[PDB]
């Protein structure tokens, strides 16, 4: 049976390139750069003692969510950078955290293979563990909520669950990734969502089946951040040969590559603006840098970061953007 | 030409002091990395070069170029007791980190939970105080010895003792380290030489011949005086790169600005 | 085993030209860049960060 | 500026502030052990002795606190989840003696220890190596020889020879040699020693920190 | 759940102990408010200890007379009390209130206590009468003297509902927002200056007196109470 993979590749390729009339490159080309787009350290969150390597911004764009080794999850008032909310983790070793789009819970995970629940609404007060989503065989590397009740986890195993916090077992599990997911990204109308795993590879699920619709290859090394752009048509996936690539659903098919000769080490984390148009990536080297998503050009520098930029997210408003690093630091730009 | 030339070595000496002493300050306090009690002591003793680098030389060089003093009949005892009372704190200031050093590498468990910022603080005030209690007794015009009980207290008190408490911390973090190819121990001996050659050729010339001079074994002249206080001066250059330079953490600091 | 029909299922989606797929990102873009904080500096005044 | 309710909120986060530090400054003299090592290197046993995911065991020793993280368990892939222990005071190495003829362990083991050895995240860390089960080294030896492994092995097969060649070629993996120190120890089954030598490598590594902090090392 | 001991009758010029044991929350990380209501007047505020002891606020009626003071091990909360007078009668609450973006300060109030003894902002609700119905929808007034739309946009204003016989119960807190448990009926919104509580589909156990309290400024202040028959 895996005699025909071959040509039903080739068949794919073929028809990827017939379809492929032209590139984004010489679309855009008459369209005016966005300049430079100069961004300044509105705000430092300071309070972690440790390397940081989640964060998740809020839908009332203040409220956000960090994770960082010394196991515990601090909100912050990003406004007032007063930290809501201080909760210890039972494992220490967490490498994702969520926010969940009502804000009533916050989940996290990491080498444990649970993605922890927490309730910020709890009428005791202290945060507690709502429940726990048990089962993964291989360290969570993201789980992104879908609703109070439903939530996705990616991890090492390879594969991604679906979960229900109020049933606390897998619904929907998706498989047929070879490497180990490391990112997950949620579409607008939350109906499809995207995960990257260390295959080079990019995966398009439904969460209501969990068929896989679409393959996305491209990448030289393994995918560690991914985003959806806004319209939900199209995502941009960071991969550890130090090149971003933007995906287009409908295409099927690579449109735009971001890359530089300075820039000579992987990705950690992609995010996008409200418009799309400026795509925000954090690298290696301890900086991060903003990519035009049409004209694909470097509009700006985000520097300040002492270590790697291992998380970023924008609000979902684009007021501001706030990058985590490994130096214990989040930075609202 | 001579007094010219004396003029900008002393200038340039006095500005590359302050400077050096700006510079650890400032990427002691922006880097996070630097913020520990060991590094606190170092940022004291660089606090306290500065203070006498831009207390004390200005005031020096304009003594030194043309020897009539008159800025003011009580401002010379302001000044004599200021200047020494920053040389005391900037001895203590070594000796204390040679004891916390020795402390670190010797009882690096128990000495753990003791190192905070609470201990640092603790010992630049016990040295702020030691040095005010050597110089309160006093309080062209320069210090008279004539008190002799005086003199040599302060002397055994400022530098005599203090020294015999480095040497013997530093060697006793020699021998901890011998005892934990031989190219590392080679290195670690030659910065504990090299600190300790630092230390005695600025300072014990100076008190050798204040010694001297107190005792009345000898008249010292002016201009030998004046060298044997430039090379004391010298230790506040020389103590930020010694305590600076060897530290991958203020390698990374500096390279940063 | 299930790779070979999970590829075969997936060949046979449905498939667009790449022009037009551009055309409409560009428009969002166009369209959603006067409402992108970002791209624009907001003023002071209406920025809650400062 | 602040009104009643905002005073409170910023009351609220010193207090979240005040409670963080004082957890990292507890966290800081805690000490974190990494445990790596074959399936059947033994480690569970040590981590048992000594006391699905990552296993954290905490235990003390002469007033330190020390916490072993079990990556045992862990099958995904090895770089995007190793340099997480980047802050390890040491990391401890289970090796199987008696695996050097079962079916090839003793090979695997050591394309771990090169791979975390030298591994850029652990350049500065030291490993405590550990050799496990020498009791039945010791007499498996004499049926099989160790020659039938690695023929560039030389001598007589005896357990001391045989176990300081071993040693010798786990030490000459090292390509950080000026930068890190290997600690190799026999486990014995020895409960109190073996808790005693971990306790002295900590130790010796704590203070190598302390002299590179002193630039003497 | 909170729960008020030492109460009883008090010569003038005594003084008592109040405590007010903590259950069922995490009372370290709550801050405390006591409220005493007269049997017939209004609510009245008293004094407030956040969370740690690390800021103990007073009303200038007692100011200097009353001290307050937490004991997180023992989850009570005391209130020691001396040179108690004539109006000092009446029934003391403990009000449970957390400070964070988005928190319900004043969500829980203890049964209470009752003791009988032998500049600021005010807020007025001429319209102490509004006989209702059940089915229909009524609105309540409230208006201060001082604009509480703060520079942040947060208009500090909090609803209480006090049914016969039982402890206010937080209805509204910040003048948008419902307390958890509170019926989508009750409506917050007004102006700056201008306040109103809105009521729809009214039935039998909304009854009871409606209290309009600021909180932009310490010492919180209560309206005089809108009863609903
Ligand atoms: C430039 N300064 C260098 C140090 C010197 C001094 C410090 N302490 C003393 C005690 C006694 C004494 O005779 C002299 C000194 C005063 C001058």
């Given at each position: 049976l895996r005699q025909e993979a071959e040509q039903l590749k080739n068949q794919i390729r073929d028809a990827r390139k017939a379809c492929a009339d032209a590139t984004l490159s010489q679309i855009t080309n008459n369209i005016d750069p966005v300049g430079r787009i100069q961004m300044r350290t509105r705000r430092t969150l300071r309070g972690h003692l440790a390397k940081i390597?989640?964060?998740?911004?809020?839908?009332?764009?203040?409220?956000?969510?960090?994770?960082?080794?010394?196991?515990?999850?601090?909100?912050?008032?990003?406004?007032?950078?007063?930290?809501?909310?201080?909760?210890?983790?039972?494992?220490?070793?967490?490498?994702?955290?969520?926010?969940?789009?009502?804000?009533?819970?916050?989940?996290?995970?990491?080498?444990?293979?649970?993605?922890?629940?927490?309730?910020?609404?709890?009428?005791?007060?202290?945060?507690?563990?709502?429940?726990?989503?048990?089962?993964?065989?291989?360290?969570?590397?993201?789980?992104?909520?879908?609703?109070?009740?439903?939530?996705?986890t990616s991890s090492g195993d390879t594969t991604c669950a679906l979960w229900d916090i109020e049933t606390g077992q897998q619904t929907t599990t998706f498989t047929g990734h070879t490497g180990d997911v490391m990112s997950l990204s949620l579409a607008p109308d939350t109906r499809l969502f995207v995960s990257g795993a260390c295959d080079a590879s990019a995966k398009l699920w439904d969460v209501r089946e969990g068929m896989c619709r679409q393959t996305f290859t491209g990448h030289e090394s393994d995918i560690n951040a991914i985003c959806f752009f806004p319209n939900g048509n199209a995502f941009a996936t960071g991969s550890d040969d130090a090149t971003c690539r933007l995906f287009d659903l409908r295409a099927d098919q690579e449109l735009m590559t971001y890359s530089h000769d300075?820039?000579?080490?992987?990705?950690?984390?992609?995010?996008?603006?409200?418009?799309?148009?400026?795509?925000?990536?954090?690298?290696?080297?301890?900086?991060?840098?903003?990519?035009?998503?049409?004209?694909?050009?470097?509009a700006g520098v985000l520097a300040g970061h002492d270590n790697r930029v291992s998380c970023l997210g924008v609000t979902d408003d684009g007021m501001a953007v706030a990058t985590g690093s490994w130096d214990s630091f989040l930075k609202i730009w | 030409t001579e007094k010219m030339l004396i003029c900008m070595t002393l200038v340039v000496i006095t500005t590359l002091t302050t400077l050096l002493n700006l510079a650890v300050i400032?990427?002691?306090?922006?880097?996070?990395?630097?913020?520990?009690?060991?590094?606190?002591?170092?940022?004291?003793?660089?606090?306290?070069?500065?203070?006498?680098?831009?207390?004390?030389?200005?005031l020096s060089i304009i003594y030194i170029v043309m020897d009539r003093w008159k800025l003011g009949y009580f401002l010379c005892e302001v000044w004599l007791s200021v200047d020494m009372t920053c040389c005391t704190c900037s001895i203590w200031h070594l000796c204390v980190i040679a004891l916390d050093r020795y402390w670190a590498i010797t009882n690096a468990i128990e000495y753990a939970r003791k190192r905070t910022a609470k201990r640092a603080a603790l010992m630049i005030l016990t040295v702020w105080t030691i040095s005010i209690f050597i110089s309160m007794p006093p309080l062209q015009c320069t210090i008279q010895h004539d008190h002799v009980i005086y003199t040599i207290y302060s002397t055994l008190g400022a530098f005599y003792i203090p020294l015999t408490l480095i040497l013997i911390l530093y060697y006793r973090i020699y021998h901890a380290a011998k005892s934990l190819s031989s190219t590392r121990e080679r290195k670690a001996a030659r910065i504990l030489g090299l600190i300790l050659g630092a230390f005695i050729l600025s300072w014990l010339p100076f008190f050798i011949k204040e010694l001297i001079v107190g005792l009345s074994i000898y008249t010292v002249s002016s201009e030998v005086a004046d060298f044997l206080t430039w090379l004391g001066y010298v230790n506040s250059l020389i103590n930020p790169l010694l305590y600076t330079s060897f530290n991958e953490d203020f390698k990374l600091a500096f390279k940063k600005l | 085993r299930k790779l070979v029909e999970q590829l075969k299922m997936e060949a046979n989606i449905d498939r667009i030209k790449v022009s037009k797929a551009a055309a409409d990102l560009m428009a969002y873009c166009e369209a959603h860049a006067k409402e992108d904080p970002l791209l624009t500096p907001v003023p002071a005044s209406e920025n809650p960060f400062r | 500026t602040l009104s009643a309710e905002d005073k409170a909120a910023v009351e609220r986060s010193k207090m979240i502030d005040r409670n963080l530090r004082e957890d990292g400054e507890k966290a800081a003299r805690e000490v974190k052990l990494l445990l790596l090592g074959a399936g059947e290197s033994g480690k569970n046993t040590i981590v048992?002795?000594?006391?699905?995911?990552?296993?954290?065991?905490?235990?003390?020793?002469?007033?330190?606190?020390?916490?072993?993280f079990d990556v045992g368990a862990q099958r995904s892939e090895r770089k995007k989840w190793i340099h997480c222990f980047e802050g390890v005071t040491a990391i401890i190495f289970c090796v199987a003696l008696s695996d050097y003829d079962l079916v090839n362990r003793m090979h695997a083991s050591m394309k771990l220890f090169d791979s975390i050895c030298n591994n850029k995240w652990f350049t500065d860390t030291s490993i405590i190596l550990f050799l496990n089960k020498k009791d039945l080294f010791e007499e498996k030896i004499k049926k099989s020889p160790l020659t039938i492994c690695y023929p560039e092995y030389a001598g007589s097969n005896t357990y001391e020879e045989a176990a300081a060649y071993i040693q010798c070629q786990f030490e000459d993996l090292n390509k950080r040699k000026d930068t890190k120190e290997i600690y190799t120890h026999f486990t014995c089954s020895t409960d109190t020693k073996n808790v005693q030598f971990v306790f002295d490598a900590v130790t010796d590594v704590i203070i190598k920190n302390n002299l590179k902090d002193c630039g003497l090392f | 759940?909170?729960?008020?001991?030492?109460?009883?009758?008090?010569?003038?010029?005594?003084?008592?102990?109040?405590?007010?044991?903590?259950?069922?929350?995490?009372?370290?990380?709550?801050?405390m408010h006591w409220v005493r209501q007269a049997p017939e007047k209004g609510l009245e505020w008293v004094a407030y200890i956040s969370s740690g002891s690390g800021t103990i606020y007073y009303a200038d009626t007692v100011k200097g007379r009353f001290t307050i003071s937490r004991d997180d091990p023992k989850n009570t909360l005391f209130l020691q009390m001396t040179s108690?007078?004539?109006?000092?009668?009446?029934?003391?609450?403990?009000?449970?209130?957390?400070?964070?973006?988005?928190?319900?300060?004043?969500?829980?109030?203890?049964?209470?206590?009752?003791?009988?003894?032998?500049?600021?902002?005010?807020?007025?609700?001429?319209?102490?009468?509004?006989?209702?119905?059940?089915?229909?929808?009524?609105?309540?007034?409230?208006?201060?003297?001082?604009?509480?739309?703060?520079?942040?946009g947060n208009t500090y204003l909090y609803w209480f509902l006090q049914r016969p016989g039982q402890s206010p119960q937080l209805l509204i807190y910040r003048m948008s927002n419902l307390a958890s448990g509170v019926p989508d009926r009750f409506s917050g919104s007004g102006s700056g200056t201008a306040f109103t509580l809105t009521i729809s589909r009214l039935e039998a156990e909304d009854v009871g007196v409606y209290y309009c309290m600021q909180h932009l400024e310490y010492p919180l202040t209560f309206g005089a109470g809108t009863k609903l028959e």
């Open positions: 390597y989640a964060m998740h911004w809020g839908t009332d764009s203040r409220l956000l969510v960090s994770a960082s080794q010394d196991g515990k999850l601090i909100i912050w008032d990003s406004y007032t950078t007063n930290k809501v909310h201080a909760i210890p983790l039972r494992s220490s070793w967490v490498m994702t955290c969520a926010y969940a789009p009502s804000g009533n819970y916050v989940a996290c995970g990491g080498l444990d293979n649970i993605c922890s629940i927490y309730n910020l609404k709890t009428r005791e007060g202290n945060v507690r563990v709502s429940r726990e989503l048990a089962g993964h065989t291989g360290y969570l590397s993201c789980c992104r909520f879908l609703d109070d009740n439903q939530i996705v300075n820039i000579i080490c992987g990705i950690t984390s992609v995010s996008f603006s409200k418009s799309g148009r400026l795509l925000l990536a954090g690298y290696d080297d301890f900086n991060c840098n903003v990519w035009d998503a049409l004209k694909a050009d470097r | 400032m990427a002691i306090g922006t880097t996070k990395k630097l913020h520990q009690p060991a590094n606190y002591l170092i940022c004291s003793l660089a606090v306290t070069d500065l203070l006498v680098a831009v207390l004390v030389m200005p | - | 048992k002795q000594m006391k699905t995911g990552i296993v954290e065991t905490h235990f003390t020793f002469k007033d330190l606190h020390f916490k072993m | 759940q909170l729960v008020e001991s030492g109460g009883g009758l008090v010569q003038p010029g005594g003084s008592r102990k109040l405590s007010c044991s903590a259950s069922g929350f995490a009372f370290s990380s709550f801050g108690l007078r004539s109006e000092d009668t009446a029934m003391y609450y403990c009000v449970r209130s957390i400070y964070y973006y988005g928190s319900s300060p004043f969500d829980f109030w203890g049964q209470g206590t009752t003791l009988t003894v032998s500049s600021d902002i005010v807020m007025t609700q001429a319209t102490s009468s509004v006989p209702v119905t059940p089915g229909e929808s009524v609105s309540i007034s409230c208006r201060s003297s001082k604009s509480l739309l703060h520079s942040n």
